[PDB]
């Protein structure tokens, strides 16, 4: 389990652990190893959060948090309390959707929602985006569901792009085991190489760092 550079060996940043809920790779064992790696390399804290999940709430991420994210965090806490010392455990923050999506955050999501509604090229790009995943799965989806899926992506985009606080703790970098279409898209957005109005409106010269860490 290592990083696929000297700022990490110099422990410059706090490190988020981005979890894809229900993705086959994110067994409790693999999550535990990502947490182990992050604790060894972090400036101080490790922030565990749910990055995606590919009517009890107006927000999809919030509904994921309450139906499933809480039971996931509980299992992670238990495993951690058996695997790590008490001093290590104290450095872990379990950041729920609520912890992350404060007032500043939701403004950035709202800018993206408004762009999704008013810019046909953005909408079409984000929707096409969703169809690539669903064309891998065996299940099929209709348009209204593809369109809603695209909105759920936008809710989570800022926490992969902008340095946000979780319970007042800034994390400048996060770990994820593989490059995805999402991480590629984010990297283009942060450089202004795609939909440059997004960088202009909600991004801020302090880009979140993506660390590719796996076995």
Numbering used by the authors: 1 to 4, 11 to 60, 70 to 230
Question: Can you provide the manuscript's text about this entry?
Answer:
Cyclodipeptide synthases (CDPSs) use aminoacylated tRNA (aa-tRNA) substrates to form peptide bonds between two amino acids yielding a cyclic dipeptide product (CDP). 20_3 (GenBank: EFK64745.1) produces cyclo(His-Phe)8 whilst ParcuCDPS from Parcubacteria bacterium RAAC4_OD1_1 (GenBank: ETB63777.1) can synthesise both cyclo(His-Glu) and cyclo(His-Pro)9.
Inspired by HisRS and histidine recognition more generally, and by the only high resolution structure of a CDPS with a ligand bound, we systematically altered three unique residues in ParcuCDPS P1, which we hypothesised to be participating in crucial interactions with the polar side chain of histidine. By mutating the P1 residues, the activity of the variants was vastly reduced with E174A and E174H incapable of tolerating histidine as a substrate. The impact of mutating Y55 carries more weight than Y189, suggesting it may directly interact with the histidine residue via a H-bond rather than adding to the polar surface. A similar pattern of residues interacting with the imidazole from histidine is seen in HisRS, in which two tyrosine and a glutamate residue mediate interactions with the nitrogen groups of histidine. Further investigation into the changes imposed by these mutants was performed by solving the crystal structures of a select few mutants containing changes to the active site or the pocket residues. The mutant structures were able to be solved using WT as a model and retained an equivalent fold to ParcuCDPS (Supplementary Notes 4 and 7 relating to Supplementary Figs.
